[PDB]
Amino acid sequence: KVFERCELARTLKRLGMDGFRGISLANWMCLAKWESGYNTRATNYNAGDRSTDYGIFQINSRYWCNDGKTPGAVNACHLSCSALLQDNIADAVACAKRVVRDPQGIRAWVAWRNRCQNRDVRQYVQGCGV
Ligand SMILES: [Cl-]
Ligand SMILES: [Cl-]
Ligand code: NA
């Protein structure tokens, strides 16, 4: 499913992402935008280390979900990576909450650092009623 901007914003708020571990909703929006373009079925193989990024938040198989083919990987979210490819983003959101519970927080995603950190991210939520 490819979410429309404001539709996603409202969904994330209802799932309790606004201010989770200090991360504003606009930051989560900026992340989803640059990671997948709001596409829940996005997958990305990383030939360099044999891991794959899954779904709307592009969560990595080496640490967060189990896909069976990633060497020396763990499953901190206790999910099959398949769960991160559903139209319903409930499982992806619960896993994202798990990710930011680690010391790095939102910084765990390098794309957030490159395109969201220290920027005016208001634009991602303006006019959405959240
Ligand atoms: Cl699962
Ligand atoms: Cl599994
Ligand atoms: Na894994």
Side-chain angles (χ1 to χ4, degrees), residues 81-128:
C81 296
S82 179
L84 310 175
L85 303 174
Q86 300 175 78
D87 277 1
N88 187 299
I89 62 163
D91 290 328
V93 161
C95 187
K97 285 176 176 181
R98 171 65 193 81
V99 173
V100 301
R101 236 173 258 150
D102 272 8
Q104 286 192 283
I106 188 72
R107 278 155 172 78
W109 287 271
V110 172
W112 180 83
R113 278 125 70 154
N114 303 341
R115 16 252 321 191
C116 305
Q117 183 179 183
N118 302 138
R119 297 196 196 237
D120 183 357
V121 296
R122 281 162 167 68
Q123 62 169 270
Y124 300 101
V125 297
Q126 297 308 259
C128 304

Side-chain angles (χ1 to χ4, degrees), residues 63-66 74-81 83 91 95 98:
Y63 312 99
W64 317 101
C65 63
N66 180 47
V74 297
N75 183 9
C77 285
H78 305 121
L79 289 167
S80 164
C81 296
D91 290 328
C95 187
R98 171 65 193 81

